[PDB]
Amino acid sequence: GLVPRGSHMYASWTASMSDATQVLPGAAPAASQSFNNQTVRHVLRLSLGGNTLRVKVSNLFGKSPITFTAVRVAKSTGQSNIDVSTDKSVTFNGQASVTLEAGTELVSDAVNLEVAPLTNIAVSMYFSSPTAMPTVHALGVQTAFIGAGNQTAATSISAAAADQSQSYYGLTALEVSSIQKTNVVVTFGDAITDGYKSTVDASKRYPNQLDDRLKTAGFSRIGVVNQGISGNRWLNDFSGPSGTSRFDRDVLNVTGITHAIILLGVNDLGFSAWLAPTQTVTAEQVIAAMTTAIVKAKAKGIKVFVGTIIPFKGASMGYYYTDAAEAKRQTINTFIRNSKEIDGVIDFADALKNPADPLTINPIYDSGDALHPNDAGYEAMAAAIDLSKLQ
């Protein structure tokens, strides 16, 4: 019959936030990016279409307030170009400018812009004042465009090509409304979820390719949002807040979440040889963190899938991969494969391993560093997933 007409918002695109000034123990301080009387135009791919949208901005890791002088949205026509006929003001309690205190985030008013799944929109921000922006999604795998003055409504960004970036600045979610029954699948992880080594501006991150499979199969109302952070660890901050500490924000609190795919831990194992020797952790400590996350998500009624840790022998031997890291990987994967608490295993390790040597990534899927898949490897990750799990 007629679908009940009550409208609801769903996360259509997400980006997990990191503090660009946070560094490893003993490391030299790191400076944040700043803007001063400048516009940043971001581009992002929507997983879910619908009738209206809203924008979530962030000063989560600011050390002082920031003021978004203007925020605008439009359909992207490639590079920095927009369809000016679709340009809309993004307001916050009716105001075009909004100030976020340090440590806070804010979702905008609804914007009347009809959008389709797997299309790109541009979200443009003007900062009139000197604005420090430590709150970023560092690894965007996507070009952002920076220019002088308020260009938020301009057809393109006029600037030098050296002013571009591949990060997202203070932009963390895009939510879209619909009356239809809708699933939201959150992919939670490290660089292998974030999509490091996939082709920039090509939407070839593994969650993008999973999304492609869903829409090709007809499931336009099953969305996939990305909560990976390159370099992320369960148990310790850097890169990004620890997985344990960000799970509530980046998984449980995602608007409309129904399913989660968790793939995290290789950095907990790999960082201790050299990057962070004071932060050695056991497989048991990783398993305990996973357990608490699984319990929390199941209590919220989320379907929880855990991926096996992909082989990584050859990845900076002696300085990331070690015999100790391999032993812990096998203990963790045994735990995953035998868990009766999770709703299912997604065996990424089995899908991507080298048939000639199961401790290495299949050479046809190796980006070249023995750790991160290439586009074909991210395609193979997506292909391994039983879409019945996401219903």
Residue 346 interacts with, from Cl ion, ligand A1EGL, none (CB under 5-8 Å by kind): Cl ion
Q: Which does 273 bind (CB under 5 to 8 A by kind): ligand A1EGL, Cl ion, none?
A: none
Measured CA to CA, the distance from residue 134 to residue 165 in angstroms comes to: 14
Rounded to the nearest 5 percent, the helix, strand and coil shares of the chain are 25, 30, 45
Q: Which of 92, 127, 188, 320 binds ligand A1EGL (CB under 6 A)?
A: 320
Between CA 246 and CA 63 the distance in angstroms is: 19
Q: Is 387 in the site for Cl ion (CB under 5 A)?
A: yes
Q: Is 267 in the site for ligand A1EGL (CB under 6 A)?
A: yes
Q: Report residue 239 as tokens.
A: 């890169």
Residue 383 has phi, psi (to 5 degrees) of -70, -25
Q: Does 280 bind ligand A1EGL (CB under 6 A)?
A: no
The residue among 332 and 346 lying less far from Cl ion, judged by its C-beta, is 346
Q: Are 163 and 144 in contact (CB under 8 A)?
A: no
Query: How many other C-beta atoms can be found within 10 angstroms of the C-beta atom of residue 162?
Result: 6
**Binding partner of 187, given Cl ion, ligand A1EGL, none, CB within 5-8 angstroms per partner class:** none
Contact 36, 129 (CB under 8 A): yes
Pairing of strands 171-178, 53-59: antiparallel
User: Which DSSP state fits 390?
Assistant: G
Q: Are strands 38-45 and 183-189 parallel, antiparallel or unpaired?
A: unpaired
**Token pair 């791919």 is at which residue?**
45
Nearest CA-CA partner of 176 in 258, 91, 54: 54
Q: What number of CA atoms fall less than 13 Å from residue 109's CA on the CB side?
A: 15
Is residue 207 a contact point for ligand A1EGL (CB under 6 A)? no
Q: Closest separation between CB of residue 307 and ligand A1EGL, Å?
A: 13
Give the shortest CB-135-to-ligand A1EGL separation in angstroms: 18
Tell me which of 212, 326, 343, 369 binds ligand A1EGL, using CB under 6 A: 369
Regarding 386 and contact with Cl ion (CB under 5 A), the answer is yes
**With CB cut-offs between 5 and 8 Å by kind, which of ligand A1EGL, Cl ion, none does residue 310 bind?**
none
Which residue, 168 or 196, is less far from ligand A1EGL as judged by CB?
A: 196
Q: Which residue is nearest to ligand A1EGL (CB)?
A: 191
- Contact mark string toward Cl ion, 313..352, x via CB under 5 A: ---------------------------------x------
Using CB under 6 A, list all residues that contact ligand A1EGL. 139, 190-192, 196, 230-231, 239, 266-267, 274, 315-316, 319-320, 369, 371
